[PDB]
Design a protein around this ligand. Structure first.
Ligand SMILES: COc1ccc(-c2c(-c3cc(Cl)c(O)cc3O)noc2NC(C)=O)cc1
Length: 208
């Protein structure tokens, strides 16, 4: 297990997300679904010139899976997947600029709901999750698990759990007071409100 420090700017963003009073928490789902769609768009585009890129799975879709016993909401997609470099360095390099822009907008009267316009919507997960685990597999790289509970650090390890073929799974370990996001009616409402036109099937699993 390797432990890394967030860039200071990202840590600051995460603290703002965690600490600011902001009731409209539901936006986290739209932002994660949007990231999944972006990743799906990318593998779809690449497959047009190299069909072999789909050998790791033809189906392009998003699943939403609540688990009350584990207190998790999991978002699974079969998009392009992230590489180790993406996880440790490259996405963070991009996020630094977006974060600066977002922070400036907030000071100028924007609200947290606009976070996605700055490319850093993933961090909105911390509105509702105490811990976030991201399991990801890109073609020709290994399966990785990224994890953070904030506090300025994240971990990356090679993942030895169930192989996913290709894509990303975001596991949200929900805060104790945020279990509404495990309810079918609530998730369904949120998807309809904010994600109705996503161009890939979104299946909302129900609980056993
Ligand atoms: C907005 O920034 C990003 C960055 C990475 C990604 C991404 C993802 C990806 C990332 C997150 Cl956080 C997610 O919730 C879902 C995803 O499928 N998988 O591969 C990716 N690679 C690219 C190039 O799309 C999706 C969005």
């Amino acid at each position: 297990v390797e432990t890394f420090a967030f860039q200071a700017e990202i840590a600051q963003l995460m603290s703002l997300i965690i600490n600011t009073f902001y009731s409209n928490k539901e936006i986290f789902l739209r932002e994660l679904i949007s990231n999944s769609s972006d990743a799906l768009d990318k593998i779809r585009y690449e497959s047009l010139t190299d069909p072999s890129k789909l050998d790791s799975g033809k189906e392009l879709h998003i699943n939403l899976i609540p688990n009350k016993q584990d207190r998790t909401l999991t978002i699974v997609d079969t998009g392009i997947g992230m590489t180790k470099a993406d996880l440790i360095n490259n996405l963070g390099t991009i996020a630094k600029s977006g974060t600066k822009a977002f922070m400036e907008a907030l000071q100028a009267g924007a609200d947290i709901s606009m976070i996605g316009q700055f490319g850093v919507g993933f961090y909105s997960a911390y509105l509702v999750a105490e811990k976030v685990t991201v399991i990801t597999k890109h073609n020709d790289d290994e399966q990785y698990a990224w994890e953070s509970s904030a506090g300025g650090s994240f971990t990356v390890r090679t993942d030895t759990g169930e192989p996913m073929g290709r894509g990303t799974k975001v596991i949200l370990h929900l805060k104790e007071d945020q279990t509404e996001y495990l309810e079918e009616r609530r998730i369904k409402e949120i998807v309809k409100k904010h994600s109705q036109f996503i161009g890939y099937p979104i299946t909302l699993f129900v609980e056993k």
